[PDB]
A paper describes a structure:
Cohesin is loaded onto chromatin by the Scc2-Scc4 loader complex, however persistent cohesion cannot be established without the acetylation of two conserved tandem lysines on the Smc3 subunit by the Eco1 acetyltransferase (ACT). Eco1 is an acetyltransferase that belongs to the Gcn5-related N-acetyltransferase (GNAT) family. The xEco2 ACT fold is divided into two domains: the N-terminal domain contains α helix 1 and 2, and β strand 1–5 with a conserved central β hairpin insertion between β4 and β5 that is unique to cohesin ACTs; the C-terminal domain contains α helix 3, and β strand 6 and 7. The binding site for CoA is sandwiched between the N- and C-terminal domains involving β5 and α3, while the substrate peptides binds mainly to the central β hairpin and the C-terminal domain including the conserved C-terminal extension (C extension).
To gain insights into Smc3 recognition by Eco1, we performed crystallographic studies on the Xenopus laevis Eco2 (xEco2) ACT domain (residues 523–702), with and without the binding to its canonical Smc3 substrate peptides. Crystals of the peptide-free xEco2 (henceforth xEco2) diffracted to 3.0 Å, whereas the binding of the K105-CoA and K106-CoA peptides to xEco2 improved the resolution to 2.4 and 1.9 Å respectively. In the peptide-free xEco2 structure, the conserved W623 occupying the hydrophobic pocket is partially stacked against the conserved F700 on the C extension. However, this mode of dimerization was not observed in either our peptide-free or substrate-bound crystal forms. To define the oligomeric state of xEco2, we performed multi-angle light scattering (MALS) and determined the solution masses of the free and substrate-bound ACT domain to be 25.5 and 26.7 (+/−0.54) kDa respectively, indicating their monomeric states in our system. The peptide-free form of xEco2 crystallized in 0.2 M NaCl, 0.1 M imidazole pH 7 and 0.864 M ammonium phosphate. The peptide-free and K105-CoA structures were solved using the K106-CoA structure as a start model in Phaser and multiple rounds of re-building and refinement were carried out as described.
Author numbering: 521 to 611, 623 to 701
Write the structure that this text describes.
């Protein structure tokens, strides 16, 4: 059963594919499982995001055909600069004025033992290149959803600033 998947970029140590919702079920089945694998690690139960028709899921596949990286993009329209949280004298915040964003990084995850290998970086590249046809997104037109500390350490370096855009906060 040789069935053709969608490559965004090929690398010497893997490739980044993408599963759109209007894809063959063989792709959706795999895409759904690696979601569940991520969400359990990130510690989520029944997410159910909005606009399910336009939510693209990226996967970094190693040379041994193992999904070592996953990223789930979704369309947004405005986001906010992350801010450092004021300390509490007696033992994260976000701006209130929004800026226009185009792509939201819902969840991103790299296999633990394969981290610090630019897998996350290359998947976020793939989104910039291939999220909207015939257009490359900027470091400032992407936003991350409720980033964890690791995530915050990642976006600060990737976006080249400390006040990178984030969304879906409370
Ligand atoms: C741990 C994690 C960084 C793994 O992804 P990754 O493949 O290592 O991401 P990258 O290698 O492309 O990191 C890009 C740069 O950002 C910095 N950086 C990334 N992760 C960092 C971390 N945990 N600690 C310190 N700096 C980090 C580094 O400068 C890194 O480049 P460098 O190693 O040459 O210094 C993170 O992306 C991840 O997947 N965590 C698991 C759960 C999670 O994602 N939480 C946050 C969701 S928003």
């Amino acid at each position: 059963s040789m069935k053709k998947e969608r490559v965004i970029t090929e690398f010497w140590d893997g490739k980044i594919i993408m599963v759109s919702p209007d894809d063959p079920k063989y792709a959706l089945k795999k895409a759904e499982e690696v979601r569940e694998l991520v969400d359990s690690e990130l510690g989520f139960q029944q997410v159910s995001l909005r606009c399910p028709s336009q939510t693209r899921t990226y996967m970094f596949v190693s040379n041994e055909k193992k999904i070592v990286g996953c990223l789930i993009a979704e369309p947004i329209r405005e986001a906010y600069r992350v801010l450092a949280e004021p300390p509490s004298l007696h033992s994260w915040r976000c701006s209130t004025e929004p800026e226009p964003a185009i792509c939201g990084i819902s969840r991103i995850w790299v296999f633990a033992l394969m981290r610090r290998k630019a897998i996350a970086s290359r998947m976020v590249d793939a989104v910039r290149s291939s999220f909207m046809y015939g257009s490359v997104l900027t470091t400032e037109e992407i936003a991350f959803s409720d980033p964890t500390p690791d995530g915050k350490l990642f976006a600060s370096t990737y976006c080249k600033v400390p006040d990178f855009l984030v969304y879906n906060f409370v």
